[PDB]
Design a protein around this ligand. Sequence first.
Ligand SMILES: Cc1cc2nc3c(=O)[nH]c(=O)nc-3n(C[C@H](O)[C@H](O)[C@H](O)COP(=O)(O)O)c2cc1C
Ligand SMILES: Cc1cc2nc3c(=O)[nH]c(=O)nc-3n(C[C@H](O)[C@H](O)[C@H](O)COP(=O)(O)O)c2cc1C
Lengths: 347, 347
Amino acid sequence: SALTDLFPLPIVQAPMAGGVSVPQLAAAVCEAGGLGFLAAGYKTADGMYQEIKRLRGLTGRPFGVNVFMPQPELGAVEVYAHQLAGEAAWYETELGDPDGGRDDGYDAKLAVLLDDPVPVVSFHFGVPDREVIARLRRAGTLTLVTATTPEEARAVEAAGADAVIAQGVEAGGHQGTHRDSSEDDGAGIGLLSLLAQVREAVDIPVVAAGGIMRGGQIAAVLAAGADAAQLGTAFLATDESGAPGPHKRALTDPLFARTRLTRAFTGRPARSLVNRFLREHGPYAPAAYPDVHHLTSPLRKAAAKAGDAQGMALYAGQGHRMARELPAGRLVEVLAAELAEARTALS
Amino acid sequence: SALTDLFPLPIVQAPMAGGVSVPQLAAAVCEAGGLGFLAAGYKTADGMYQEIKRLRGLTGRPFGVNVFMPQPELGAVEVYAHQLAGEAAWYETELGDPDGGRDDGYDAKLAVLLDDPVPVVSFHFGVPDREVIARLRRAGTLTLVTATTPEEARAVEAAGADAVIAQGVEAGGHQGTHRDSSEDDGAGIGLLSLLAQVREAVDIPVVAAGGIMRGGQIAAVLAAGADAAQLGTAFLATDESGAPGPHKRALTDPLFARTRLTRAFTGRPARSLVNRFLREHGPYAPAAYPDVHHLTSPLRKAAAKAGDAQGMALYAGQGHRMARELPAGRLVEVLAAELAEARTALS
Ligand SMILES: Cc1cc2nc3c(=O)[nH]c(=O)nc-3n(C[C@H](O)[C@H](O)[C@H](O)COP(=O)(O)O)c2cc1C
Ligand SMILES: Cc1cc2nc3c(=O)[nH]c(=O)nc-3n(C[C@H](O)[C@H](O)[C@H](O)COP(=O)(O)O)c2cc1C
């Protein structure tokens, strides 16, 4: 409730890196009664700060900022790089440096978030030290962390976080596993099942994420114990979304009818529409994040520049085909109406 | 509604072959207001008939009977059989004949179901010819068919079935795919997402299946458009369930903390608790059903006889750890109370 008391509708716009969730998206969601989110992933502490300032100028409503947890360091990357030689030659460029930073400006970003507190902060790819959570709490910032299993959820709670984001296997983008291993492959838990398990494993509020595209699904997760629903793909296709045109188009394109979890683009499991890049490199992508992400960055930028969807990281949840293209503000009101209608029906 | 009008509670006990859903289980579910189910899979038309008679003597309430669709015929089986040589030697037996029937007494079973109509009949592993559905309808029998994608659901509707069972990836036992192929691997759709897609693809009632263990999850699927919820694993652990003791125990045993889809036991994707047999033969199991099932039958019977869970097909959904051991009748009333409580909360 401490979370749901911040905004009127149980709808959260998921932070989406790669220039997807720009300030204008968050603002439209915020102004419509939902919780807009900025994505600090892959940006510099300064870049993130500029968006925060920008957004404050667009809305006075509560919003969130998401940060990536630093990843532990460490021949597999060399082999994969070799297999990408053809991609480099084709897009006429060179692979990025796989040994770049792995902290993603964590320290600097926390410094910014503590020096000028924002309403909400979420973390992905792990759990912050409980000291980070305590300091943010004292600053008046609510904290959220993603969990993909009841065990990870317990870790989130034990750290003192205000709420846990239960991200099911249907979710688009990166799976928020706290540690990536070949064992996670084929072990993903369906949201409806994960939510029930998490709801019984912890006592803190739960935000449900994964495949939510309609108001009735929001009603569904609330009925199963969630305090709110977090939607990424549904907002990815809205007008304020900064996602590339080829990306927004792929979502409802019959030729991109299926999605699959893959490490091809970044070295960590992420759900993307199946395309050429995924089919050819998916089976061989090693578990090396963010090493692989650095490596393929030039390839993806080149592909995007050319408008070639077959070479881009088309992150999307299993509900992508139900995506709707319209202002984010209108999407929220539509979702709200569907929610109301579903509530009424269930009574 | 034609379906939900047959019984008071939106709860369906999934048919479970292998001696799991015996007449006493179905009866307890029926008498508690739900829809009990008998499983005709792997049985003879006569065997199925005896259970039908038995059940009628235990309850006058509506119940269902499930039948397997005949599978198309067709060196991979020879290789797998070779890899099982050690299992045969250990359990001191011989592998079964992989070239046994593939129809599973379909014709004879339909003859029985048409000569002495039952309230409900469901089909698994495909869609019956529309003539079979029409004749059963004329006999006064409602028909259900499982679908794992919006496309399969459309096929179910086009065939004239009364309702489609949307079985999500979390479901225990066999995935009801109409055709099995290596491509289905890693393509499973989370129930919450599948349900929304199916609800919008067809106009007939939808029965949601997969990972449902609590009343709140039943409320969740109803809110998302389902007319009822079908539960297998939840009833697998009840006292009336005929599942082996080692099987019921594994469900909540920490040593069997995870489930995975595998072809190891039958040649078709089925979700089972991870065990020795699965770890060793899963990666090599070919797509050959029911050939592989015939082949491993002696191995599984021997394992069950010895009470060795590591060599049994421990079918179970991702919610297995939430299984409760008590009379099926009491489980239904508990689920009903949880459902009511969830409805109230959502209002
Ligand atoms: C475009 C793409 C980018 C994403 N980027 C982030 C991110 O930067 N940080 C994060 O915590 N989650 C990210 N997510 C995951 C979302 O938080 C959420 O779990 C997911 O979008 C839920 O599924 P649908 O996408 O709602 O099915 C991303 C998802 C997609 C769709
Ligand atoms: C013990 C085991 C045996 C099953 N046998 C059958 C069967 O014979 N016919 C059928 O249509 N479905 C069968 N199912 C699948 C169920 O119809 C249902 O989809 C599944 O149980 C739903 O998941 P939970 O098991 O509810 O998570 C079986 C499932 C399990 C648990």
